[PDB]
RNA sequence: CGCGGGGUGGAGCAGCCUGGUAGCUCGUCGGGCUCAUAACCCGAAGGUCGUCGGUUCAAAUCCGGCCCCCGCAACCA
RNA sequence: CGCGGGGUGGAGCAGCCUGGUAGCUCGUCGGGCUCAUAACCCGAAGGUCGUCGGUUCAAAUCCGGCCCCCGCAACCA
RNA sequence: UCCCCCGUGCCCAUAGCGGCGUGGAACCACCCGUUCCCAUUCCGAACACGGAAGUGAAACGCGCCAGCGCCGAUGGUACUGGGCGGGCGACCGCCUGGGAGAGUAGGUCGGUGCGGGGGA
RNA sequence: GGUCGCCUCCUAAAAGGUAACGGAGGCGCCCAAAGGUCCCCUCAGGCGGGACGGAAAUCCGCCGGAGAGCGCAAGGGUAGAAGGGGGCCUGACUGCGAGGCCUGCAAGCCGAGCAGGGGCGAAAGCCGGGCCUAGUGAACCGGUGGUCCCGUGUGGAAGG
RNA sequence: GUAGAGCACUGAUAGGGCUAGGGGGCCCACCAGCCUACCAAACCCUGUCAAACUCCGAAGGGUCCCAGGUGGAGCCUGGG
């Protein structure tokens, strides 16, 4: 639906090594992406100042989409929450917008962190998904420096039709994931 | 003593006591048990009383089981007060007991020795009693 | 004497009885309008020819005969099979 | 009612006679009320407001 | 346990059922669209006009508009005027919409 | 049993009604003054608010029950 | 329900009476002096003159609505 | 007129959960795209249209068995409407119609009604 | 000393009803959205994952029939919505009311349908406030606004 | 929706198994060893208690239809 080189890498390289690996029969049951929910749960503009969306504009420059907000589930005295305050943001990346994001993180952004050292491998789901997080925000130079302010990061899940954590790894590793172990 | 550590309501109604027991009609843990022959309100101070008795009978030994637990609150008006102006106050707790219920049963000791420590146990009890033996019938439910 | 310096209670009340329940029993011939059933909640549901007011009071919508049907997991229903 | 919850008669405009009355809050929304209400007097629908009770 | 899909059915389904007037169920797959008039008392079908039996093809929406008009003729000739519209778990729009507007103009009554 | 009162940094007092708000005075520890001590001047330290459980998103606070303290009737002809 | 007068710095507050600068003394930091603590002397801090809204070259002073507290006068089936 | 799918009820878990197999010929689902109508507090996930390359892997349809769920008698007992009895009292017992709950033996991976399509 | 009206549960003995200075708890309000409707969504919770970030902030995954929610107490009810989100809205209309619940009286309660004129919806339809059951007061005496009915010889005005 | 009975829900509950936490060890005291005739949540087993708990549930009671029922029955309007 767009000429992206990771869409083409998954097909013309990643698809087959998997069929030769776990020896699939049918074609659909082969592991495959689904979404990349990016949670910028800030929790710092609750009854705190405006400026919340001042990240949800850079969040758009990362993900191409406009992020939509998330509200306070329930009130907590220890966090200063009343049932309704906004705390964080979340963009769901489906179709080719999803791809092109990873075609910038996996081979430009991930190395843009100092003291970087691969990825944590225990953190796979159990029914075939994976996630972690990030703190530094200009980790993609679409977010240039003299957009300077308080640095905040994101929680990021990636969702796949993988059926176990095992085969799952094989996908994410094959699409360029540096694993720490 | 034996208060139920917590409870849903505090003052409990009185209640009748019609007929024969509901359950607890067979030995289940010990090899000899003590059996009620007439309805009663056995008290936290009696259960305790009968228990301690046997323990001090075969000092260091045996395993005492206790099948009825005093949950009902025994209520009672003070002295030199007349009828009404509230419902009585709680003093002590009790366990409803119909005939046939087992209350104590001991496991593992000389047949003589259990047959005493359950005999003495009955005298601390406000009712008539019969000691019984674990049974084919007992293992049959 | 006898009365002295005791006290009393903190509780002691009760509400006016509401006289609810099933007002019309199955096979009773009804005019349109008769309250078939008084209730809190929906222990009975509005069947054929039967309405329900903002207190779940079910009422005959046309003359006929009350009929009763327990359709299990989707509950009891009250209808009226209008003798034509 | 109490004091924060005021009582009021719904005013009018298209004939200036009152025809309704109800309740509202002045610590919540401290303005002048708003409802469409057909009248037995003008025999037409009209937008209404308020005055004290 | 239930899917949002089947809930929406019951929901949209339940209401209409309470008004007694006849029922023009609208089923719709990615290929064809079907419909059938139902008395829900006895539990029976009055008349059924579908895209597949009519062997029509040539754009899904415009396909349906005829199948709707087809249903009206096949029912007017039977005596049905009064019939309320069941729109399934589908938003009344486009395809289902067409079926209606077809049935509508064919002389049918809702 | 019953009425109503107050329990809070070591002593003595606010903060309770109106639910997010530890206050004052001594006292204390640590710096000066003075040959020395106090006085006196200068900084700091110090309590899950009787206690179980309670309701609120939270309890000094709103809330029920024994544990205390305190006036407190109990007429008994 | 009806009539008297009002907020101006955080308090207090005449200015307002009379149409021209937002102000007296109380409170802070600072300097003075200081046995200290005083009072004293210098200085700045500080405000939107209940609110709109209006007559005017102009308004704290003047008019309308209102608002909010003080008060007064009655009435309460 | 038997068979198979699709729609839709009726029954209310003996129908369900989980498991093994399974069917794309037709229907159905995924599916192809996001121009158009329609849609997302972000996203064509859903809802929406335009189609038809692939696929029955998912979902679903149909078969299989009792691990769970669930239905679960007969016999007997509890209690009991009516009528009586012996006890100083506590409470027990008898005739007479009625008769559970638990538990045992067991049952169950459904039965169906009109309409439509498609091969005997 | 405590109590006095209304609501919830129990006592109350399987229709209703039922006492006690019997065991327990709540009301004297609240909301122009918490109302109307048309549309869409489905919980509490538990295990794995999750930069800050924790027992619980927001996130992802399977798991789950209702144990969450429904303004406040309790009960019944309830996702096949009564709960959560949005679009348009004001029926929180008027003129009436068959028939019934309850019932000593007076009260209270439920209400299809007809007219008028609106709202939301393509529509079948639904709306005479709120999931329901508390959130209150007879008659008398007055206040305010309409009407244009009475008004002491007639017309006014006073007064009803 | 009661007697009974039951534990599916709100709670109680005694022994046992499992098992977060907590406590005594003690290795050691920087993090960490994971060992416990001690306490103990959630859960599983045996075994039980409840007016304001009910997965279930009698006899019975209510009431409408039909039939029997001529009774100091019944029904309406009135006077005491
Ligand atoms: C005693 N009196 C006068 C009252 C009578 N005429 C006489 C008398 O004896 N009265 C007393 C008589 C009994 C009364 N009393 C006491 C106990 C009780 N349980 N109930 C009573 O009525 O208390 C009375 C009381 O003090 O008035 C005075 N001191 N004035
Ligand atoms: Mg392209
Ligand atoms: Mg969420
Ligand atoms: Mg005795
Ligand atoms: Mg009291
Ligand atoms: Mg009563
Ligand atoms: Mg009364
Ligand atoms: Mg239902
Ligand atoms: Mg009016
Ligand atoms: Mg049918
Ligand atoms: Mg005090
Ligand atoms: Mg303070
Ligand atoms: Mg010296
Ligand atoms: Mg000093
Ligand atoms: Mg109190
Ligand atoms: Mg005056
Ligand atoms: Mg002024
Ligand atoms: Mg100025
Ligand atoms: Mg049926
Ligand atoms: Mg199997
Ligand atoms: Mg097989
Ligand atoms: Mg195979
Ligand atoms: Mg297959
Ligand atoms: Mg195939
Ligand atoms: Mg939408
Ligand atoms: Mg959506
Ligand atoms: Mg078969
Ligand atoms: Mg097997
Ligand atoms: Mg089985
Ligand atoms: Mg039997
Ligand atoms: Mg018998
Ligand atoms: Mg009889
Ligand atoms: Mg008898
Ligand atoms: Mg006897
Ligand atoms: Mg078997
Ligand atoms: Mg099966
Ligand atoms: Mg064929
Ligand atoms: Mg009655
Ligand atoms: Mg609304
Ligand atoms: Mg959702
Ligand atoms: Mg959740
Ligand atoms: Mg996080
Ligand atoms: Mg968290
Ligand atoms: Mg409830
Ligand atoms: Mg709703
Ligand atoms: Mg809604
Ligand atoms: Mg809205
Ligand atoms: Mg519109
Ligand atoms: Mg009428
Ligand atoms: Mg009338
Ligand atoms: Mg009437
Ligand atoms: Mg009456
Ligand atoms: Mg109406
Ligand atoms: Mg209400
Ligand atoms: Mg509503
Ligand atoms: Mg009410
Ligand atoms: Mg009153
Ligand atoms: Mg009078
Ligand atoms: Mg008047
Ligand atoms: Mg007047
Ligand atoms: Mg005149
Ligand atoms: Mg223990
Ligand atoms: Mg340790
Ligand atoms: Mg070990
Ligand atoms: Mg061990
Ligand atoms: Mg347990
Ligand atoms: Mg018992
Ligand atoms: Mg009971
Ligand atoms: Mg039950
Ligand atoms: Mg019966
Ligand atoms: Mg009747
Ligand atoms: Mg008479
Ligand atoms: Zn008018």
Can you spell out the DSSP letters for D1-32? --SSEEEE----SSS------EEEETTTS-S-
Strands E22-28 and E83-84: parallel
CB C45 within 8 A of CB C78: yes
In a domain, C8, yes or no: no
SS3 C52: strand
| Resolution of this deposited model, Å | 3.4
Query: Is B81 in the C-facing interface, judged by CB distances under 8 Å?
Result: yes
Instruction: Identify the bridge partners of residue B140 per DSSP, sorted by sequence position.
Output: none
Contacts of residue B11 in chain C, CB cutoff 8 Å?
Answer: none
Q: Where does residue E108 rank: exposed (0-12), middle (13-18), buried (19+ CB within 10 A)?
A: buried
CB B69 within 8 A of CB B95: yes
List phi, psi (to 5°) of B133: -105, 145
Q: Which residues 11-70 in chain C have a CB closer than 7 A to strand I?
A: 11-23, 31-35, 38-43, 51, 53-57, 59, 61
Q: Taking the CB of residue A63, how many other CB atoms lie within 10 A of it?
A: 22
In a domain, C6, yes or no: no
Compute the distance between CA of residue A132 and CA of residue A120 in angstroms, rounded to an integer.
Answer: 8
Q: Which nucleotide is nearest to E12 (CA to C1')?
A: I80
Compute the distance between CA of residue A171 and CA of residue A126 in angstroms, rounded to an integer.
Answer: 15
Question: CA B28, C1' F45: Å apart?
Answer: 65
The total domain count for chain C is 1
For CA atoms E16, E18, E21, E27, give the dihedral sign.
positive
What is the DSSP secondary structure assignment for residue A55, as one 8-state letter? T
Compute the distance between CA of residue E99 and CA of residue E69 in angstroms, rounded to an integer.
Answer: 8
What is the DSSP secondary structure assignment for residue A111, as one 8-state letter? G
CB D21 within 8 A of CB D10: yes
| Pairs across B and C, CB distance < 8 A | 16
How far away, in angstroms, is A124 Cα from ligand 58 center? 86
User: What determination technique applies here?
Assistant: X-ray
Contact C8 B82 (CB under 8 A): no
CB C46 within 8 A of CB C35: no
Query: Is B79 in the C-facing interface, judged by CB distances under 8 Å?
Result: no
Q: Which segments of chain B does DSSP mark as H helices, in order?
A: 44-55, 111-117, 119-123, 136-139
Question: CA A68, C1' H41: Å apart?
Answer: 6
Compute the distance between CA of residue A43 and CA of residue A72 in angstroms, rounded to an integer.
Answer: 9
Name which of B14, B1, B2 is nearest B76 in CA terms. Answer: B14
Strands C76-80 and B72-76: unpaired
Contact B86 C2 (CB under 8 A): no
How far away, in angstroms, is A154 Cα from ligand 43 center? 14
What is the DSSP secondary structure assignment for residue B29, as one 8-state letter? S
CB D37 within 8 A of CB D19: yes
Question: CA C43, C1' F1: Å apart?
Answer: 46
Compute the distance between CA of residue E72 and CA of residue A31 in angstroms, rounded to an integer.
Answer: 49
Compute the distance between CA of residue E104 and CA of residue B10 in angstroms, rounded to an integer.
Answer: 70
Residue found under tokens 């401290």: D30
**Structural domain that includes position C72:** 19-84
Length of chain B equals: 141
Query: C-contacting residues of B 17-56, CB under 8 Å?
Result: none
In a domain, C27, yes or no: yes
Interior/surface letters A106-130, b for 16+ CB within 10 angstroms, e for the rest: beebbeeeeeeeebeeeebbeebbb
Q: What is the CATH number of the domain that holds C38?
A: 2.40.50.100
Chain B residue nearest residue C1, CA to CA = B80
SS3 B3: coil
Name which of B92, B105, B110, B103 is nearest B44 in CA terms. Answer: B92
In a domain, C73, yes or no: yes
For CA atoms E50, E55, E60, E62, give the dihedral sign.
negative
Q: In angstroms, what CA-CA distances link A28 with A13, A31, A111?
A: 16, 8, 33
CB A44 within 8 A of CB A152: yes
CB E66 within 8 A of CB E56: yes
Interior/surface letters B47-70, b for 16+ CB within 10 angstroms, e for the rest: bebbbebbeebbeeebebbbbbeb
Q: Taking the CB of residue A30, how many other CB atoms lie within 10 A of it?
A: 18
In a domain, C84, yes or no: yes
How far away, in angstroms, is C8 Cα from ligand 15 center? 16
Name which of A101, A106, A111, A123 is nearest A176 in CA terms. Answer: A106
In a domain, C50, yes or no: yes
Residues 6+ positions from D38 with CB-CB distance below 8 Å? D44, D45, D46
Contact B82 C9 (CB under 8 A): no
CB E64 within 8 A of CB E35: no
In a domain, C13, yes or no: no
Compute the distance between CA of residue E106 and CA of residue B14 in angstroms, rounded to an integer.
Answer: 77
Compute the distance between CA of residue B13 and CA of residue A176 in angstroms, rounded to an integer.
Answer: 73
Contact B86 C8 (CB under 8 A): yes
Would you say the C-beta of A76 is within 7 Å of strand F?
yes
Which residue, among C2, C3, C6, would best test binding to B if mutated, counting the most B CBs under 10 Å from its CB? Answer: C6
Q: In angstroms, what CA-CA distances link C7 with B80, C38, E61, E68?
A: 13, 42, 83, 82
- Rounded to the nearest 5 degrees, what angle is found at the Cα of E103, between the Cα atoms of E101 and E108? 120
Structure tokens at B109: 């000791």
Strands C45-46 and C76-80: parallel
CB C61 within 8 A of CB C80: yes
Question: CA C62, C1' J2: Å apart?
Answer: 37
Instruction: Identify the bridge partners of residue D12 per DSSP, sorted by sequence position.
Output: none
For CA atoms C56, C61, C64, C67, give the dihedral sign.
negative
Q: B91: part of which helix (H) or strand (E)?
A: strand B89-97
Question: CA E53, C1' H119: Å apart?
Answer: 17
In a domain, C5, yes or no: no
Closest ligand, as measured to the CA of E43: 10
How far away, in angstroms, is B141 Cα from ligand 35 center? 21
List phi, psi (to 5°) of B11: -90, 130
Query: Is B10 in the C-facing interface, judged by CB distances under 8 Å?
Result: no
Residues 6+ positions from B29 with CB-CB distance below 8 Å? B65, B105, B107
Report helix angle E60-76 to E94-105, nearest 10: 30
Structure tokens at E88: 């399934």
């Amino acid at each position: 639906p767009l000429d992206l080189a990771l869409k083409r890498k998954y097909y013309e390289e990643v698809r087959p090594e998997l069929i030769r690996r776990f020896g699939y029969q049918n074609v659909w049951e082969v592991p495959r992406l689904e979404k990349v929910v990016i949670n910028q749960g800030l929790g710092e503009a609750k009854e705190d100042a405006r400026i919340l969306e001042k990240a949800a504009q850079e969040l758009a420059l990362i993900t191409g989409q406009k992020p939509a907000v998330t509200r306070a589930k329930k009130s907590i005295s220890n966090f200063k929450l009343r049932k309704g305050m906004p705390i964080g943001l979340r963009v769901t990346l489906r179709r080719d917008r999803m791809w092109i994001f990873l075609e910038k993180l996996l081979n430009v952004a991930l190395p843009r962190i100092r003291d970087f050292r691969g990825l944590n491998p225990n953190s796979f789901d159990g029914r075939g998904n994976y996630n972690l997080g990030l703190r530094e925000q200009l980790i993609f130079p679409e977010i240039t420096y003299d957009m300077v302010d308080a640095l905040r990061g994101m929680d990021i899940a990636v969702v796949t039709t993988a059926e176990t954590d095992e085969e799952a790894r094989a996908l994410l590793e094959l699409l360029g994931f540096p694993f720490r172990k | 003593m034996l208060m139920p550590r917590r409870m849903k309501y505090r003052k409990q109604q009185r209640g009748r006591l019609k007929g024969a027991t509901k359950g607890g009609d067979y030995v289940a843990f010990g090899d000899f048990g003590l059996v009620a022959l007439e309805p009663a309100w056995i008290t936290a101070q009696q259960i305790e009383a009968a228990r301690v008795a046997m323990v001090r009978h075969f000092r260091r030994g045996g395993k005492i089981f206790i099948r009825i637990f005093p949950d009902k609150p025994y209520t009672k008006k003070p002295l030199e007060v007349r009828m009404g102006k509230g419902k009585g106050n709680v003093e002590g707790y009790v366990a409803v007991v119909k005939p046939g219920r087992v209350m104590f049963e001991v496991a593992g000791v000389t047949e003589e020795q259990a047959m005493e420590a359950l005999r003495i146990a009955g005298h601390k009890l406000p009712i008539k009693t019969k000691i019984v033996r674990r049974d084919a019938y007992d293992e049959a439910q | 004497a006898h009365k002295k310096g005791l006290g009393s209670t903190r509780n002691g009340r009760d509400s006016q009885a509401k006289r609810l329940g099933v007002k019309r029993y199955e096979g009773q011939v009804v005019r349109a309008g008769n309250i078939l059933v008084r209730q809190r909640g929906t222990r009975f549901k509005p069947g054929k020819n039967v309405g329900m007011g903002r207190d779940f009071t079910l009422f005959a919508l046309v003359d006929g005969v009350v009929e009763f049907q327990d359709r299990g997991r989707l509950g009891r229903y009250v209808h009226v099979r209008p003798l034509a | 009612a109490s004091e924060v919850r005021i009582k009021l008669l719904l005013e009018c405009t298209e004939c200036k006679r009152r025809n309704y009355a109800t309740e509202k809050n002045k610590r919540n929304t401290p303005n002048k009320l708003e409802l469409r209400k057909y009248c037995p007097w003008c025999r037409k629908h009209t937008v209404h407001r308020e005055v004290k009770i | 346990r239930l899917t949002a899909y089947e809930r929406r059915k019951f929901r949209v389904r339940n209401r209409i059922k309470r008004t007694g007037r006849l029922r023009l169920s609208v089923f719709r797959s990615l290929k064809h669209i079907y419909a059938q008039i139902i008395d829900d008392e006895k539990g029976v079908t009055l008349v059924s006009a579908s895209s597949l039996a009519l062997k029509l093809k040539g754009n899904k929406t415009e396909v349906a508009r005829q199948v709707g008009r087809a249903l009206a003729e096949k029912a007017l000739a039977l005596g049905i005027k009064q019939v309320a519209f069941d729109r399934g778990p589908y938003k009344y729009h486009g395809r289902v919409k067409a079926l209606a507007e077809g049935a509508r103009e064919g002389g049918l009554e809702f």
